[PDB]
Amino acid sequence: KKVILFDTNHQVSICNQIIDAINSGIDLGDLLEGGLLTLCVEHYYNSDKDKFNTSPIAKYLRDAGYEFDVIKNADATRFLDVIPNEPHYSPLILALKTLESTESQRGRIGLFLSFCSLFLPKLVVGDRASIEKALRQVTVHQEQGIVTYPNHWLTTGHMKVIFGILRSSFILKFVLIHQGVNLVTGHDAYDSIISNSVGQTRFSGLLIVKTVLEFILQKTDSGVTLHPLVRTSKVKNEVASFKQALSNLARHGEYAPFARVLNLSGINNLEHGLYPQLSAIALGVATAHGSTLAGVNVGEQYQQLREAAHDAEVK
């Protein structure tokens, strides 16, 4: 899991050219993630290695197994110049050799990251859903005068490129979600878009299981407990499984609302599908308060235990 950062004295040049290349649909191959990290070390740290090595961003990516490698080259203005000299970067070298690159203003890194952040809220549902959402949200930020993206970023062709970059990059998505959740005033104006989108990504693909959980929990004199019917012998397997799945999620700590968007490990058994008895009981309990667990279909053989949970939540 080696990630190459690029280190030059004209970082802003180098960076905006990586953005040009991403916007042009050029495939950076294995240099993608270290391209995108290299960006990020600017919107947040001026290419200062020392300030980056102390951030909670760097600690998490190391705790996740990443190790950063560095291309020191001081005297070079083009992204072209920082690509290592290997046959396997030839077709990338070729594409970069011919690419468009206008003079680049500094809002642009930030502007780019803000735009990527708009795909998060529905990323896990697929391209169509991530793109229609992001397009509705461009309308809100444009209308607020917060930003106007270039009009050509708003085509489905361009948007598909960006969505695929997001699916492809763990690091990109994580920088966004972290800086998202730790914003107060932000690094700059582009940061509050990121936070707002990231706020709307919270429990994406974890909302139904989250709800089922909520409704199998009861208040008591002696603290918060599981509901009595959950602690019976017919539910013992499901409870043990659910708990192990739930314990896997809680390893992700503050990033656990974003586990599925980040594809974090150990959440494969958090489908509410797998716990039909627990789904029934949450339903029973929800209906008495009186929610409708939307997406929780209660199969017909578990209907009695739903009733049991409902009748006894009123009692």
Partner: peptide, 26 residues
């Protein structure tokens, strides 16, 4: 079930704020 402060609990179980086996047993 009440208070809709359950959401605070349930989310805490999910982000490791509320110890799990306190609710679910060892």
């Amino acid at each position: 079930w009440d208070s809709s402060y359950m959401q605070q609990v349930s989310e805490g179980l999910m982000t490791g704020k509320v110890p799990i086996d306190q609710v679910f047993g060892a």
